[PDB]
């Protein structure tokens, strides 16, 4: 076994805000004037050898629909018409490539790698970690003469209670924990919002304890070898420190949720009041 | 001889024996011949030899094997520490129930099992991909939206119509590429413009989180250990099932009094040498490779081809370690087991395993 | 090495000529108007 | 129409007719399809620099 | 249609995935740069005579 530190998961999804970010209010209304602009210029050189018709026509080709029946029909309301589409790709082109990026650098964080990530050269207040008071761990801290600094943030909110650190980190409180492993690797494995830090921090083993030269030292160590070239301990493991058996991780594409896209809804809901708000309008009008 | 552990090298045709930081080792081998032998275990002996009394040379073996038993006449690296004709014997050399009979062991410094080799394959990029990239909740939201919608467009037309109306409405969100008709009347074209400028983003939406799932890429080849289907059933899955060990091992000694079920399949797959094995990998003349990972560890971080790794590692055979001979029923024992524990003490392990432990492909 | 960036949002400066072109097409237009206003003589 | 159709050919158009030559614009079409894909693929690079 | 859809947003999603791993080769960073405590043969490298 080994030390090792303990982390709680990210809960990935939570990276989306809306669908009007990508770009800024600035180049929405501007591009919303444009359009009129281009309108307009068409109708006065049609004009000057279907207004409405014109300005539906051009208003429409950025959303790819077909409504509207309309055309060019001089010479340089066609030469126009063409490099008016070719920005329109443009838009929605460079649409996709940011909304692509927002979703590629979508790195919330790497999780902290064993005792040397230099975040616990000197930690800020943002990760809070500790070990149990009077745990003999610390004496691998003392004894070693290196980690004297961390001695000292680690004693800022040591948690005097082994079986609460669990809670400490289940609060939010604690977010990393050092310990050891064994039974860390078991921990985690109750339910998959708590992980480790894969890192192995010291190496060493467990083993039997008996009075200076028993009878039975040299004796009993050969069955626990024996046994262990079997199948014993592995077997028994799998029975007792793989409960749930639960997988590590990914960086999880993070798939969207309704949660975060249906913003587009309300406008659908409000293009669907318009409706109404509009009906009558041009009935009258006629 | 060894895998790193343990390098011979020959002498320098100037200076005569060869460099420093490096113990001679020369004997009457062959027929008295010569080399210095740099390595792990080198330091890890020359550190002994500092707090304790002095040792003597060096000397290689004859009998070839790892230690062997044949005969009751065990053949060998401890062959030659049950007639004491060596006080002891040091390298890379596991620790069994047959080899810890005769002579004792001190206690074991580097942990070790047997474990499983093979290129990583790329074989899969996404198993089934084109639904990931969405929640169940927008999808029922599109369609009910389009199911209210329709009815919306039909009951603004009363201030063809009802069946195509919605075949349109459908057939615009998938690139509205269907060649289609009748839309008319100038108070509900804005609604569909309006559906028509959700359909694009939605669409570009939907490709941009789809161009991520690919850049994700965590292959495995996740088959189990040595309670596996495929071991289990060597041919009846795939023909080129081949495994692959190197017998006079105490891996083979294991792997045989446990499973002969399967150690008689394995027999055609003996090999010569230890790199053969690697190289008949990396052509893929051998499906999979098993061994001790004591040195499966160390060979990956050391090819560029970073295929060449473990399946998940520690699940592996058995958990052993190696240790140190020494002749039975003496008293160095004593001093020699606090003496690696104090090195434990000192943290000076993962210093020279930092010497030369490391690899590129430990990221 | 260098981080890199979060994947800002978009604004007018990075889409510079994207309406620059534009306009010069429109003065194209505009040329091109002055030319039939001028052919009425063919 | 051609030049239209390289841009998503959104334009509304007319005038497609005659068995013979309807398949040539069935492969300018196909064309211009994994044009457009290739171009905003490789757009979709230039912002992660 | 629904199916088809799919085919081209696949290809753009492929297509954009062979530009972003499309990375040859990381310089090599000084002495310490692994590759440089044994060399293959397809990096070659030395000093001046003396
Ligand atoms: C295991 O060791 C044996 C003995 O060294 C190897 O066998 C021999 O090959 C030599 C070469 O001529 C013969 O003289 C011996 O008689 C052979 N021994 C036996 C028992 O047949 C054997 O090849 C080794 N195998 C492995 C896998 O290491
Ligand atoms: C992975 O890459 C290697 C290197 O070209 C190739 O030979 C192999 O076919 C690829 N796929 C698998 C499953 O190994």
Not at chain 2, 277 to 283: E, G, I, M, N, P
Request: net charge neutral.
């Amino acid at each position: 076994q080994g030390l090792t530190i303990l982390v709680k998961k990210e809960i990935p999804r939570s990276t989306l805000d809306s669908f009007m970010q990508p770009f800024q209010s600035t180049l929405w209304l501007l591009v919303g004037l444009s359009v009129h602009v281009v309108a307009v210029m068409l109708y006065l050189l049609d004009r000057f050898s279907t207004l409405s018709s014109a300005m539906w026509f051009s208003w429409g080709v950025l959303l790819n629909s077909g409504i509207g029946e309309g055309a060019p029909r001089s010479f340089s309301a066609r030469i126009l018409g063409m490099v008016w589409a070719g920005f329109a790709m443009i838009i929605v082109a460079s649409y996709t490539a940011n909304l692509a990026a927002f979703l590629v650098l979508d790195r919330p964080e790497e999780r902290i790698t064993g005792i040397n990530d230099p975040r616990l050269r000197n930690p800020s207040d943002k990760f809070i970690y500790a070990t149990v008071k009077q745990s003999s761990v610390d004496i691998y801290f003392r004894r070693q003469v290196e980690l004297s600094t961390m001695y000292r943030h680690m004693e800022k909110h040591n948690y005097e209670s082994a079986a609460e650190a669990i809670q400490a980190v289940r609060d939010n409180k604690l977010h990393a924990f050092i310990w050891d492993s064994a039974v860390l690797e078991f921990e985690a494995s109750q339910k998959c919002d708590l992980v480790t830090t894969g890192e192995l921090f010291f190496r060493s083993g467990f083993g039997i304890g008996m009075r200076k030269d028993s009878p039975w030292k040299q004796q009993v160590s050969l069955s626990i070898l024996k046994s262990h070239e079997n199948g014993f301990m592995e077997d028994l493991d799998k029975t007792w420190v793989r409960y749930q058996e639960c997988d590590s991780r990914s960086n999880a594409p993070a798939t969207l949720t309704c949660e975060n896209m249906a913003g587009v809804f309300m406008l659908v809901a409000g293009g669907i009041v318009a409706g109404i708000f509009l009906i009558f309008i041009e009935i009258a009008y006629k | 001889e060894e895998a790193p552990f343990v390098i011979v090298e020959s002498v320098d045709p100037l200076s005569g024996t060869c460099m420093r930081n490096t113990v001679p080792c020369q004997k009457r081998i062959i027929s008295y011949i010569k080399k210095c032998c740099k390595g792990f275990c080198i330091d890890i002996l020359k550190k002994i030899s500092k707090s304790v009394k002095f040792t003597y040379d060096l000397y290689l073996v004859t009998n070839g094997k790892h230690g062997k038993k044949i005969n009751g006449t065990w053949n060998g690296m401890i062959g030659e520490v049950v007639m004491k004709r060596a006080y002891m014997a040091v390298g890379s050399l596991t620790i069994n129930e047959e080899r810890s009979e005769v002579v004792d062991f001190s206690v074991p410094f580097i942990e070790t099992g047997i474990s499983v080799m093979v290129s990583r394959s790329n074989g899969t990029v996404s198993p089934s991909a084109f639904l990931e990239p969405f929640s169940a909740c927008v999808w029922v939201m599109m369609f009910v939206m389009l199911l209210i919608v329709s009815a919306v467009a039909v009951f603004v037309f009363e201030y063809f119509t009802i069946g195509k109306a919605i075949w349109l409405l459908w057939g615009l969100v998938f690139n509205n590429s269907v060649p289609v008709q009748n839309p008319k009347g100038t108070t509900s074209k804005i609604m569909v413009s309006v559906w028509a400028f959700f359909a694009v983003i939605f669409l570009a939406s939907y490709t941009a989180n789809l161009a991520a799932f690919m850049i994700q890429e965590e292959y495995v080849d996740q088959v189990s250990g040595l309670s596996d289907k495929k071991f289990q059933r060597p041919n009846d899955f795939s023909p080129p099932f081949r495994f692959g060990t190197v017998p006079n091992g105490s891996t083979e000694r294991n792997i045989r009094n446990n499973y002969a079920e399967m150690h008689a399949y394995m027999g055609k797959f003996n090999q010569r040498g230890v790199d053969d094995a690697l190289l008949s990998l990396k052509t893929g003349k051998l499906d999979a490779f098993i061994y001790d990972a004591a040195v499966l560890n160390y060979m990956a971080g050391r090819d560029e081809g970073c295929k060449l790794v473990t399946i998940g590692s520690g699940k592996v055979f058995a958990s052993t370690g190696y240790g140190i001979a020494i002749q039975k029923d003496s008293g160095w024992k004593r001093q020699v087991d606090l003496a690696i524990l104090q090195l434990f003490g000192d943290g000076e392990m993962e210093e020279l395993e930092a010497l030369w432990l490391t690899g590129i492909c430990h990221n | 090495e260098k981080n890199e960036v979060m994947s800002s949002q978009l604004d007018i400066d990075n889409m510079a000529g994207v309406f620059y072109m534009l306009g010069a097409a429109m003065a194209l237009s505009l040329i091109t108007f002055i030319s039939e206003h001028l052919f009425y003589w063919q």
